[PDB]
Every structure is written in C-alpha cells, then in structure tokens.
Design a protein around this ligand. Structure first.
Ligand SMILES: Nc1nc2c(ncn2[C@@H]2O[C@H](COP(=O)(O)OP(=O)(O)O)[C@@H](O)[C@H]2O)c(=O)[nH]1
Ligand SMILES: [K+]
Length: 268
C-alpha cells in the first residue's frame, strides 16, 4: 500500500476515534507529514507517538517517607475510590504499610465503601461523619499515619466539579493544611481520569493541574472500547507522568503504565 491523501485522512479518522483530540491529532499529522509505503508510515507514527509518551513514563516511587502522601484528585465517576484500593493493595504487596483517608466526606457510599474494604483487608481507614470537613479528615489521617509509622497514606477527595462546589479552593486548602504537618506533602498529586470520558479529561487535567499541580495520572477503564488517546494531549500540554492504567473492576486490575503496549493497543 502506498502513501497518499487517503491514508492521512484514514489516520486522522483513526486518531480522532481514539480521542486523541482535534488539536493533538492535527499537530501529530502535520509532524507525521513533515517527518515523512503505508506500513512505513504507521511505523513512523508509532515512533513519534512513542516520543510523546516517553516524556511522561516515569513510574511512581513511594519509598522513603513517613508517610509518603498521595492526594487523589479527580471528578466523581472516574474510578477514584476503586483506584485507591487497587493502589493500597499494590503497596502492601511491596511490603509497605498503608493508611487511607476518606476525604470525600459528603459521599456516604464512597466513604463506607473504603471503610469496609479497609476493614476486610486490615488497612486503617480514617473517616468522620458524613459531611465532615475534608481538610480536617485528611489532617487527622496524616497525624495518625505519622503516629503509626505508616509508609503510604492515600487521601481521597471530593469530586463534584461545579461553581457551587468550590472544589479547587477546597483542594488548595487541603494542601496548605497538609504542609503545616509536612512541607513535602502531598508527595504525589495523582489525577484519576476515565478513558471513557475522552477529551473531557483534558479540561479536568487543566483544572486540577492549575489548582494544586499534578505529579501523576492514573488512566482508568482502558478495558472498555475507549482507547485513552487523551493522554497525548495531556502529555503535550502538561507533561504529567502517566503512573498507572486501570484495566478492570477487580482489585488486581491496576497496571504500571507502559508506552509500547499503550501505543499498540491504540491501533488494535
Ligand atoms: N471496566 C472498568 N471499571 C472501573 C475501572 N476503575 C473503576 N471502575 C468502575 O467504575 C465504578 C466505580 O468507580 P468509583 O471508584 O466508585 O468512582 P469515583 O466516584 O471516582 O470514586 C465501578 O462500577 C468500577 O467498577 C477500570 O479500570 N475498568
Ligand atoms: K480499550
């Protein structure tokens, strides 16, 4: 097969369906045309996509803090609660002690889901009454983690993103409250975004990144039909490391991010 305008239009369609986005797709194609049979083109495209993801493939390292604090941010419905448990199991398998903070204080089901999971798995969960102050719950969790020599503290947060909610200011307050106990905390600000939301994750990454500064991303629900192409836009615009991929609903379904596999899956 030979290179022509039909192949570049074919590639654009495939990238748009993968949620790479209009802007990122346009940039990628123009770079592909300038950089440049069909098979060679797909080889070159995968290579240039590899160069994008290479800049954000740093794996998360949680060792050496007391505790290492992960602030979990994201909007509701993306898999934040599930991911926290998957992370907790991951770190415990590595021999680290874990504590959870139920900072999404107005969602009773989310709080109780964490409490019950933690109880079943012998992981302490710091929680207060429904509607309690998120910053206070997370304050108590850090104190308890320090008192109890916990290696990793994972702090959940609210995820209602509307002008009523003042979520960004709440997160900023949480961070300031954190730094009164440990100036290095939070050691990781982990955004969870849902592959099935497509390009809406770009807006979310922008909001959370501008408010508290993201240092890592978990992309969930890659096991659906969604391709997760938004990460190219986030990488190009923000350069935030992709730490993990969610590949299911089971507690094991959290995988370290791998650039090569992700690229192949995008075209499968
Ligand atoms: N297929 C799939 N479902 C996921 C994944 N991560 C989370 N979920 C699903 O999304 C729902 C829960 O998301 P949840 O953690 O409650 O969302 P939150 O509101 O962001 O805390 C559940 O039905 C989970 O099964 C994933 O990686 N793959
Ligand atoms: K997929």
């Amino acid at each position: 097969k030979k290179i022509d305008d039909d192949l570049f239009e074919e590639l654009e369609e495939q990238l748009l369906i993968a949620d790479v986005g209009v802007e990122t797709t346009r940039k990628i194609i123009t770079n592909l045309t300038e950089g440049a049979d069909a098979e060679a083109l797909y080889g070159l495209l995968k290579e240039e996509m590899g160069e994008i993801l290479a800049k954000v493939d740093e794996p998360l390292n949680v060792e050496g803090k007391a505790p290492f604090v992960i602030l979990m941010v994201g909007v509701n419905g993306v898999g934040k609660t599930t991911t926290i448990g998957k992370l907790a199991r991951q770190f415990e398998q590595q021999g680290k002690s874990v504590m959870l903070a139920a900072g999404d204080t107005f969602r009773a089901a989310a709080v109780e889901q964490l409490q019950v999971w933690g109880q079943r798995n012998n992981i302490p969960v710091i929680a207060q009454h429904t509607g309690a102050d998120s910053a206070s719950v997370i304050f108590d969790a850090i104190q308890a983690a320090k008192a109890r020599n916990i290696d990793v503290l994972i702090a959940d947060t609210a995820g209602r993103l509307q002008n009523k909610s003042h979520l960004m200011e709440e997160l900023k307050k949480i961070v300031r409250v954190m730094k009164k106990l440990d100036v290095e905390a939070p050691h990781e600000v982990m955004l969870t975004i849902d592959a099935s939301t497509g390009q809406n994750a770009v807006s979310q990454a922008k909001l959370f990144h501008e408010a508290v500064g993201l240092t890592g991303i978990t992309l969930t629900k890659l096991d659906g039909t969604a391709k997760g192409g938004v990460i190219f836009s986030v990488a190009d615009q923000f350069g935030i490391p992709i730490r993990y991929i969610g590949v299911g609903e089971r507690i094991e379904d959290l995988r370290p991010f791998k650039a090569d596999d992700f690229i192949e899956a995008l075209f499968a």
